[PDB]
Design a protein around this ligand. Sequence first.
Ligand SMILES: NCc1ccc(C(F)(F)F)cc1
Length: 330
Amino acid sequence: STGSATTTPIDSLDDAYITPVQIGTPAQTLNLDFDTGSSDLWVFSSETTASEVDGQTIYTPSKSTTAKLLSGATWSISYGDGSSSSGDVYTDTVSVGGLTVTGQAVESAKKVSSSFTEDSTIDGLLGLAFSTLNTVSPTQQKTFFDNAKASLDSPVFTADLGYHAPGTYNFGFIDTTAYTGSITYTAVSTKQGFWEWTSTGYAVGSGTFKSTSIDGIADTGTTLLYLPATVVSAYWAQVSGAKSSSSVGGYVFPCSATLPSFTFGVGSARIVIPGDYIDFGPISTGSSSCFGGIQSSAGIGINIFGDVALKAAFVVFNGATTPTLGFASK
Ligand SMILES: NCc1ccc(C(F)(F)F)cc1
């Protein structure tokens, strides 16, 4: 089997991407943030605290004839940005672009944090990291990809995120028309439950490529590109007037600047992020200082190849018995 669904930025800055997902019988369609950095499929629901719902579409399990309460199961998740949610668990039928899993664990939110309430466009998350990170207790549950894998034509899914435009998540096949050149595959460590890999280096604009190993995760659920402080300083030093702002919480730059590109290595291959992808717009409405799309990972503990990096590439999440990651230009 295969599945294919269009993913759309939630706003004019590509802060996140939403993909429609069918849940239950009859179908309830919710727009979920597909997150290769986490492993819980959770949704705003009829059970979510009323004051914490502000325009999201809710899943109502009592209206789904295939929904079954997973007895005694609860979940609670905290993300690296400080956001969180928690609730109880149903199993139900879940479909993405024609690909169907019966008995998928659907985590129904009873509580969500302020950042979720304030994003009216995100009805929940669909985790695509490794199932070892799933938070359901006392019986851990599998991701949608993990459940579908054996039925897929190939045990893979691909992320083709757009810059200021729609893109595609495919399950079970590689669309060879969706990229240029070849896909370079690189090793993955699953030891922390992430799609963790090692970039072979970087360049800033037309500068000399620096060969250096950068361990990090491929994370569609994170907006920006978080890299070591030395790398990030080298990038922003090329932008006249850019500086690290402690009040703002990262590097900012004059909105009048044209940004240099940033290149990252995948084996001997190179992925070029156009400079415009690195502009995240005014720090506050009407300001002429703009927030940078490449930020230091120093306070995080891990480097994150978030959407800024991934949307420059066609990305293969290969769930073969030894998982690997593939990157192609596009
Ligand atoms: N990395 C997962 C994630 C995704 C979205 C959000 C937000 F911004 F919608 F709350 C937070 C955390």
